[PDB]
Amino acid sequence: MNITVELTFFEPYRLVEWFDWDARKKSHSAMRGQAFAQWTWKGKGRTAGKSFITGTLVRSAVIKAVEELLSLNNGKWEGVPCCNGSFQTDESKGKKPSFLRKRHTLQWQANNKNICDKEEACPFCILLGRFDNAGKVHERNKDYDIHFSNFDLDHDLRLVDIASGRILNRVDFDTGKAKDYFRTWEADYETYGTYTGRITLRNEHAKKLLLASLGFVDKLCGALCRIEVIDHNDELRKQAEVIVEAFKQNDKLEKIRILADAIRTLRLHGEGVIEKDELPDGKEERDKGHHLWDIKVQGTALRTKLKELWQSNKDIGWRKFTEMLGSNLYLIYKKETTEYYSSDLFIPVTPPEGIETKEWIIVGRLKAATPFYFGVQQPSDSIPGKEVINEHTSFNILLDKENRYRIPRSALRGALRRDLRTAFGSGCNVSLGGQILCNCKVCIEMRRITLKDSVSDFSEPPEIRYRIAKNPGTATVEDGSLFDIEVGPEGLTFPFVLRYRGHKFPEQLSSVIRYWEENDGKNGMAWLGGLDSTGKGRFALKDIKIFEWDLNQKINEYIKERGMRGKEKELLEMGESSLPDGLIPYKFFEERECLFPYKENLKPQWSEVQYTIEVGSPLLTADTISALTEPGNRDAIAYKKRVYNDGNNAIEPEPRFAVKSETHRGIFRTAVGRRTGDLGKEDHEDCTCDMCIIFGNEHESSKIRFEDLELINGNEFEKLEKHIDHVAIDRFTGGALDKAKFDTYPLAGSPKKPLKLKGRFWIKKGFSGDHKLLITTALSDIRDGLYPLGSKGGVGYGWVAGISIDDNVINNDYVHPGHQSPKQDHKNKNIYYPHYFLDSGSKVYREKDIITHEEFTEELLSGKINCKLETLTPLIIPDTSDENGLKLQGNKPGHKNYKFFNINGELMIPGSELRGMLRTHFEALTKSCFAIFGEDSTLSWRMNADEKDYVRDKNRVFLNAANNNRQYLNNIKKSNHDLYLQYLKGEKKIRFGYPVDDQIKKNYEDILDSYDGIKDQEVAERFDTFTRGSKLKVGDLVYFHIIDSLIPVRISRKCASKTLGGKLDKALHPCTGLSDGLCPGCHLFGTTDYKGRVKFGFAKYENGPEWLITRGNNPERSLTLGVLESPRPAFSIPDDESEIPGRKFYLHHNGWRIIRQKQLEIRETVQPERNVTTEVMDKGNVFSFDVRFENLREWELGLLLQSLDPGKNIAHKLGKGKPYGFGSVKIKIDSLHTFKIKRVPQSDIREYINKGYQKLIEWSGLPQWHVIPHIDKLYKLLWVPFLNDSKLEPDVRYPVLNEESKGYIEGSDYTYKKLGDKDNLPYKTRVKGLTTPWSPWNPFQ
């Protein structure tokens, strides 16, 4: 009579808001969700409600199951025949049912003995309820021979808790882009998948059928089902407000956008990175510590504050805590800074009796051969019932409530439908709302196909792929083009289930299954999910097992076992013996070569072109966000990915380094666009160019799918990642810039041990020969080194040495006159300053027509220069990765000792060093701006006691006054200690208005901040100059001069009216942006807004005396240098009247001989921490490097070639110890190749340099280069007296501080007390001496 039945889901079932049948047509979502579960609210506010399943829907499922069961049994179930049943209600006779069947009614041959009526009816009619008192309108529950009550959820209830709203999708087959999308709620089957209802049956006769119907109901509301008969976020936001405010107080608001990312990356790490303080620490002996994690938040370090927050918010998970903290920081930073839904006929279907209906069940694992991405809408708008950018992660991956990676049934089904459409060779676009089922083969097969929403046993956080778009014109980041994608790890396995209820297993579905397989010799081709063009979600079907239900003769076993819906993983795990009766292994699965649609449509659909890139230089695809959260404190580290190991069932411990499929695809796209000119198109809207056809428009899809360039040589390298320090040298002073010092952590590539990056891309079937040739040409361009991988390509990083495709796919004869002073002084009695300042002049030529990188301009030159750098003096390029390279830190604590710069044991000159030295020389040649300048640096000079505006009884009186004052102070201290404290600070008067400008008060603040006291803090605090501290405030007893100077004490330091940037002329300032133009140096070598057109590779050593060899040093090849101290602009600019002298250039001298011959003295007198020990090259060492230039004008190329090889006796200065004579390097061009690849003859090279000279003459207003005054000064600055057969050995050294200081030459005036004195040497004469190169300084000219 009455039975209670529970329907249990095994997929996230579809939930829609319940509406009355009259009110349902108003909303399209409810029209779509008629076959879904229905959610009805309670109360107001749309927050609480109950979910249920209408008994009409369960009745429809039961009726479909009964129709199927009777068709397989030819209308006779359990020996009692059933008629075809009636499924047509005429409007005139009665009201139409609320749901009208648009599908084929699966009929049979009616063998009923008598026509069914109210008195007698077959079980089909009883279950249909044709003849009971109940009709279309409902009166009472006792009028139903069959009654399906509403199925109420068993477990107030909140919609967001039960269901999650997700935008689904319809994707066009031809273009690969979505035609439209729609929203659905996917409720939790794990917690809310059981719905209990009541079915009443007045007529017991049909009972045996009805129960079986519950067995054959496979899916309901979008989920496979079986029917059985029986606020921390607010607190985190407030804390993130505190952190953002603390960053604001430090003027570091932008770093919050960094922090909000890094905090999120912490979710990949465990809580230990906060609990065990595994965040990177700052540099050794650094007061500020880490630039991010040591930022003081409410007076405590950011790492400590994060630890306190984690302890406070330990109630929520570490992943949730870090996600919400990063999101809140992101939102506070942001604040502080086609939905398509959806003639009745009764079409019978009578399958032939001879043909039998079976059910195939295919189980397996979808393993992500590449990182997968299943797009989902942001959690902000994913709230069910609710259907500033406020999205921390741009692209979020689809997960569960348990954070498990989920492949939705919808995405898997859509990918399978696409693959089936390809395999059949033809198909239809899925039409929505069609009253007639589509007759296409694809749709017919898909109606028989059921798939299971697969979720992984892996819940670890997704990795973040950072994608940018390069601006083709300037080859820099497009403005606004930066986003993050949540991607699941590759190798992750999902339980794949595919049921096919059909007469025979189609050949095309077998072809698709074989296509998705990898087996042994093929690759899995299940392009599930999105971002496929960037090689996302290429899945492989593995561990496959296909079984068979004989539904025509063994249907009862299927009904009993419910088709094992929800037990498919157990079936995959179980063996052949444990299979249930009626489920036999399907051993007829045709092999891969047997499927005609596979070889004719699926095998050639995506052709795999796999290759290996040999990178002969260090490769840095920067991952800064990970570097912020990882130990080592590196500003940029190489990108590494998390790979899931199925065998270990966990992420592999050591990440796989790779050049991103996004980076790979972008490199290829840029190559193709530049070779075709399509990259230069302003917009690609409704475009059809070759680049758009190959790589996809906003409407079509990419015909080429790039995957990651996995590093496969990593095991070979003993130290895979190389630490390369970089610095920016101020143009005016040869010292480093104030804040521009950093370090990179690329992969240690080298010409002898290149990094092998194996990567593949898939070519769409039917690719044009033009497009295939374009792809091959782009691959050759990568092979030819045109496009370096990763960042710092212009500095030498990521230079591609070669490419292996898989089998199954000149001298400059100028002799400079030199300087007359060293030539006349053949006995070398004169002494010259180690550095002199070249003032080319304030006039700087800026070109506003910026040469673009969007194409290789035909008239402009593009090629490679092979040059032979040769050291004329010992070269010191220290490998500052390890400050203990020589392993003498233990013997001498605090002593920095480096090896020569080497990658994998072979000596090198980093291309950044060569690029910087050549850039300095070129900017001196072309009168370019001071690209690197300490503009913020101020100037201060000690004033002596002069300050020309332009005994026993006295000692006893002083002593008595001091004693009386101390007695008074002690008496007041006895009276009140605080009163004495104030008296000493001057807050209160002790018995016995010139306005202050902002700049003057700022000068006082800098004097206080730059005050250099005693080193020892114990004596410093007592003996330091006592001021109330920090900034000038009300009540500070101070000194002033008419006012001009606000000094804390008498005889303090004068401060300059203008900073160093103010001292420098306006035209010489570094170029900012591109609107005002770029100087020749900044146009050639590039700026922050414009990528440079010259890339300097790493200079590899070949031959020569390998090292400078010396007895004294512990390493015989090493050498200890003198005290290299910071350049003093106060000497070059003695007073505020003096202007910036110009670029600092160091003389070419054998002053290293003095250092080498005085090694014991340098080691004994100099404190170990002050000086450094280095591995040192010798004279004659030969390195070779490549200057890869693109779109270079003829005069630009000529000037660059003149910069490389200036003349016969003109060389350069490179590496450490330049003021000590080290680094005199002679560069000689072996060859100049230019492609449009042809070697340029010497005559053409000379014509380039000759017409480069013409540009210099034009700017000033075989060529002699010294006729140009500033070029003459620059070349004598770089003239090498000892290079030729000349016997000149000039004495070039810094003066000592005073006579008593060590190193003072006895009897000479070469002392800084003498030279800094205005009487012995006035300021203007000193500046003139510093400005005229090779001016004698011991006898001053």
Add this chain to the structure above:
RNA sequence: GACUUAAUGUCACGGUACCCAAUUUUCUGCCCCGGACUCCA
């Protein structure tokens, strides 16, 4: 009971949150003169 179904008709497993974009642009691991404040003849 009701919330919440209508019964001779639910292909919604009828729909891939899909397509487009190079974590990159610039930078010499570099370097010499200062660093303090008073004293009373």
Add this chain to the structure above:
RNA sequence: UGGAGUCCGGGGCAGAAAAUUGGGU
């Protein structure tokens, strides 16, 4: 009434500026 003086010591920066999403169906 103004006189100019007493010291030989000492590291620095260690990332900066940008882009942090836009279009489509």
